[PDB]
Amino acid sequence: VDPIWHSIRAEAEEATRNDPVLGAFLYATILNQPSLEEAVMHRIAERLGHPDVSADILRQTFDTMLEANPEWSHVLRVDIQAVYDRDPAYSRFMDPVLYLKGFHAIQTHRLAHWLYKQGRKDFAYYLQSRSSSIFQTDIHPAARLGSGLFLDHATGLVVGETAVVEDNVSILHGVTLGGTSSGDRHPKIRQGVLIGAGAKILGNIQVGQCSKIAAGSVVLKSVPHNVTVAGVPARIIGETGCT
Amino acid sequence: VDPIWHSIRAEAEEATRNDPVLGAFLYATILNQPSLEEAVMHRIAERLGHPDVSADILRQTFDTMLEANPEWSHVLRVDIQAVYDRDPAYSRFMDPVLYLKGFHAIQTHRLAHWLYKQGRKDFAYYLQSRSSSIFQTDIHPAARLGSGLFLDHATGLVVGETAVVEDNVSILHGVTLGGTGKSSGDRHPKIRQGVLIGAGAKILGNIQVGQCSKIAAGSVVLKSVPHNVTVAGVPARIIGETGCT
Amino acid sequence: VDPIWHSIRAEAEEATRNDPVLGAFLYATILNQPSLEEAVMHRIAERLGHPDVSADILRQTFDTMLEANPEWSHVLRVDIQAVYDRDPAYSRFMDPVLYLKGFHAIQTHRLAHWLYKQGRKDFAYYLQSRSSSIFQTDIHPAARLGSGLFLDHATGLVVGETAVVEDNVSILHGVTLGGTGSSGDRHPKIRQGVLIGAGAKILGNIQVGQCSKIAAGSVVLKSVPHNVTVAGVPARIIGETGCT
Amino acid sequence: VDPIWHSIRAEAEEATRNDPVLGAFLYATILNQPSLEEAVMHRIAERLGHPDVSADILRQTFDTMLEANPEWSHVLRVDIQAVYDRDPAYSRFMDPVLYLKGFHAIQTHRLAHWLYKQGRKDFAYYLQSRSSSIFQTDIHPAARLGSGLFLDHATGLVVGETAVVEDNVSILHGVTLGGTGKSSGDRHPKIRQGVLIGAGAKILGNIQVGQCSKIAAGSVVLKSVPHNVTVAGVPARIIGETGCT
Amino acid sequence: VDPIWHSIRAEAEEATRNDPVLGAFLYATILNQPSLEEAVMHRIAERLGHPDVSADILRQTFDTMLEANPEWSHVLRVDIQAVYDRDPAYSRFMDPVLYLKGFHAIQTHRLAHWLYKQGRKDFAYYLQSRSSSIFQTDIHPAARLGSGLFLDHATGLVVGETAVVEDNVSILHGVTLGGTGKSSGDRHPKIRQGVLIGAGAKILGNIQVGQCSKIAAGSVVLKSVPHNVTVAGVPARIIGETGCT
Amino acid sequence: VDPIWHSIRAEAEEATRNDPVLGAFLYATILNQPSLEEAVMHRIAERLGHPDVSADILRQTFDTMLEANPEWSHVLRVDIQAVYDRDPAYSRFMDPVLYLKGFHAIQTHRLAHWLYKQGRKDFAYYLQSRSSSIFQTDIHPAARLGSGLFLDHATGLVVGETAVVEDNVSILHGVTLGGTGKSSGDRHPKIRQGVLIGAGAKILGNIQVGQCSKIAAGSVVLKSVPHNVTVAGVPARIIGETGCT
Lengths: 243, 245, 244, 245, 245, 245
Ligand SMILES: [Mg+2]
Ligand SMILES: [Mg+2]
Ligand SMILES: [Mg+2]
Ligand SMILES: [Mg+2]
Ligand SMILES: [Mg+2]
Description:
By secondary structure, chain A is an alpha/beta fold. Chain A contains eight helices and 15 strands.
């Protein structure tokens, strides 16, 4: 049972038929692959590949991560499901896999996070640098991100060293989870939270579960659960629930 | 008669004499080209090319768009003329064609939009994905952008699926024409002709910005803006009257 | 003696020991290089290198800039020292040289700026274009940037043609030093020691006085006195501060 | 009508259907191309392309050669027909166009040869160098090669600066059309119409190989060869009579 | 129990410690690989990879042939064993896997041969074209090559469509197993077990070279050669007796 | 003074004005370079560069060789002078530096030879493997080559582990300095000074070719040759007197 994988294979076959100049891209990336994991690792490694460190090295490293962490198989599928559930602009499971840099960046972080805890700090920093340049997402490898994360549009995401994001969170573009203290100094974003475009959340503060942070908000103090905050500085302007 | 082409040709010629190391780039992109259209498609294809999908296939596919849409020839030139007229930092028609990712992003979108309407949705998504990563401009292929569009600096632009931008619009970096977050069906802004949108501005929801209006940098616009006004702030308020360029 | 360069070589040697698969990257960019300058020029050239204009051409041109501006040797070391002193997420001098695109964007501008003063505007604009696309930093070649500059995270930086930034300034991502809405000199002057918060927009022919701090998300449309903190849309003075 | 072209397009269509992963290669090289000329020029540019001199610059230059030498359209097709008639290992018109380096090298020579005449000697020598490295054919740009030329397998062919090859010749791999002692002047072979040159044959000096004759494999030819003979051995000696076909 | 595999890993580890700049190459090609088969496929795919057809697609296609053809695992190791035993210039099992183009060209043909039989003739001919350009070995995908084949130096190898090379054969560079002889049908040589073919030798026509025989460098062979002889000369003459060993 | 270098710079300058599209190539390879050494190292590294092992790593390793072997500065110049003096087909000192794979193969070998002597055997074999594939010259890094070596056309050169080539030797394409089949230690030829070796010639065994002698094209040399003679044939016989220069 892997309904997502078989959906993705069917989409890739139709796409190839529908546009056969894309067949090298679709066969290499989806159709020739033995699994969804290897198709995701392959695509991300090809986007991050560079003369400095080949796609192959990245792909091979990704594989060793997947072997030290077989639960990523589940997390990964939950992440794809998040996009499929939450983004109306895209209708296929194949879309975050092939196209969506936010999805690419999340799994890249998962790689660099694992590497970083292994003492492989340069590899992790390399991935961090490459993701920042190619996906425009600067996430410190020490950062903790939950499963079912939705990073929509993504451009300009900054996430600090001691930041934590829990499960089922949605983050848009232009968001900072940063400082400025110099110990634990970055936000903790509890489960189900939505963070709107351009929001700045600064300091070791907490954003309560199910809360919403309106676009352009500057959040300088903890936000309770089930509320909506907005503005510079952010004040409560509404109530909400984990919908 | 094509004064934009011939002036770009003479700009490239001087640039090569001035800096001979750039001769391969200037000849391949401009001087060896038979037309402005071909030069523009070449430059863009080269910026977007990747081992996943070669610049050649992008270039070839661009040309199929120009065949099916000859009016792109005119749209291309008014988009160049917009940069020439509105940006004081550059003085040559060649500058947007060679260097400015905003201009490249616009034409990329026009290709993707055409492809999307033809049912070639993976090709359109691929271009949108590549434009987002390379030009930092995330424009859904279903979005509708008019001619005379000036995308200045560009970085961080997001334009939603149901957005419409009319003619002679100018948009700065860090601009979102997006949704509130509910949110389905027509849920993205309508930007009427002559509008200027300042840096970092967020315009959210199926709301309209009336013709010839100006949105100051950093504004968060949640309700419709009438024509002929300037709005600023979080949330936006009308601060002044204003007119078209 | 060049303790910064000698620490980097040591950091890179241990790095390859620790992770040998990165040996090609680390030997090519650091250990094989005769100097810190050539390691920095080489990394930047590899990042910006493209079929259109090769890394080799970029690297060669960088060396000519170095040859013509000996003082860059000193400026480069103060910029590195700044990341080391001011950023708690990184512990090695090698970090900005290898990974930090803000650092790479600054030295890229110093090259484009020099080129642009030589009349080599196309080479200048090509660098500007590439840096805007690869490092997400759009700095006009005519802008002036002082030494000890720290560009943290960098993504979305926009710096206009007439902008001036003095020594020892720190600038976060999403910053605009731009204009609104004119003709000539229309861009800000950021005096020494200033800190500019994430997302902050500083527009027009205005100045931010020495040691001042602009908070995250501030929109600054009037000149800011020395030794203050400003915040808000639009910004107002919310405090007093000094240099460090 | 251009029957060769139309056959090639149909063959490329079937090929893509039979093995879709080859679709990018087959579309970019054949199906997206507007003419046979452009398909051939494109494939060759891609094979020769390098970071030193991009495929694009090679492809643009080639197109410049075609404009100044409209005769090439014909030469190209008779070269292709030569392969289709003389090689039993291949059944399709597109085989030479996509795959056969001997064919690629002849058309590279034609480009180099024209450049050379134009005083563009670096570009000529660059192609010669790249062809020698990638197709293993070293042909001096000053060499003259006729049409209906068949370079079968090709590896290790060397053709001297003053060599001439007439129409309808077939040359195998390992063939030297080379020099003898030193000497500076006219010093390489003139090969007349219809000659077949066997594998590994060495033909040295300003000597002539007459109309319709056959050099067997491994022959060392140091003296002129009459028309309508077959020669063989070291030193090459006549062994039979032969004619054209 | 894969003593070849285990020695190769150990050679790669030592080589990386000895020359750390080669670490990316040796990790990616050896030490990050799960098997000898995947390392050999990877190396070959990287050497033949091109923007026309990526290394990735080659590697994926290779892995498919391994799947459908489990026999190759054995043929591969008797090939590698052939090199270790027969070449005095190289001391490691890692050497053919990484460096030796003759070894690469052999395994490449085995892929192309399989594809050709599946009806994927274009992919077979692309591999043939690419091998001929990069390894200088032109082997028709319909040629039948036995196990334990040693191709030493390789440059200039040409093997016709109807050729058959039996097991335990050694072939030097510059060798042709070719035709006369565009007669169509069965028209290329049949080389029997244990044969040694010297540099430069040309074997032409549907003829046979019998077991354990030795063809001296430069020989031109136009008629069947019996078992257990050494032939030499242009034309080739039996000059002696020889045993297998 | 360094007249070779100055002449190359002037040639380069002239070439770029003659053909501006080649400016990126000619600046990056010659005009932007501070020495002849660095120009030659750069060209070779760019031809040999691959995703497996970047041109930068090769170029940096070549620098290391130069740092330890300042003597190569002279060896390099006399190698360039050999081409200028001996090849009537090219009139500029720049020609071998840019174009001639035989000259590139020589300096590649000198690097590989030095690495091999340092115990960096894998880097040495990789260079040997790459040169074989890209220049078609298979030279074992343990071979000793003197200065003033002219490798004309080069395709198919094979030089064995224990071969020695003394100064001012000229070797054509298709040449083997190899072994016979009774191999142990020294099993490859010794070519003394001033020898000319003709195209396709095979010199097999631990035999010696004496001073100023000439080996005619196609020859198979199986026993030692005294000084001041020409040999020819299969196998080769002394056919006259000669004397070199
Ligand atoms: Mg390509
Ligand atoms: Mg092409
Ligand atoms: Mg190059
Ligand atoms: Mg590759
Ligand atoms: Mg030559």
